[PDB]
Amino acid sequence: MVEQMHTDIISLWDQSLKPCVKLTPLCVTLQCTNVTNNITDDMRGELKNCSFNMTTELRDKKQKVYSLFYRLDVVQINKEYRLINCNTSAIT
């Protein structure tokens, strides 16, 4: 019963993620800095303020956007960073 439950929980997980928005376009070069606004000692370096050139509704138009990421989700390449998933898998 444990093997069937394991299989069914994984199956339901994948069924739920399957129809959701794909984030493949986000595996682009990020330009990140440290978040230093009211940062406690325990959180220094934990949040990265990453800017990037993102696509828009139209393929010929771009937008410059930023997002905060946790240190564990962003890996340094060569202030240039990439998501940890860029060399392993597409993320949904």
Ligand X SMILES: *[C@@H]1O[C@H](CO)[C@@H](O[C@@H]2O[C@H](CO)[C@@H](O[C@@H]3O[C@H](CO)[C@@H](O)[C@H](O[C@H]4O[C@H](CO)[C@@H](O)[C@H](O)[C@@H]4O)[C@@H]3O)[C@H](O)[C@H]2NC(C)=O)[C@H](O)[C@H]1NC(C)=O
Contact residues for another protein (CB under 8 A)?
Answer: 24-25, 27-29, 53, 55, 59, 62, 82, 85-91
Give min distance, CB of 79 to ligand X, in A: 9
Residues 6+ apart with CB under 8 A from 82: 27, 28, 29, 30, 74, 75
Give min distance, CB of 75 to another protein, in A: 11
Give the binding site for ligand X (CB under 6 A).
29, 31, 51-53, 64
Q: What is the dihedral of CA 69, 54, 86, 82, to 10 degrees?
A: -50
Give min distance, CB of 47 to another protein, in A: 22
Which of residues 54 and 91 has its CB atom nearest to ligand X in the complex? 54
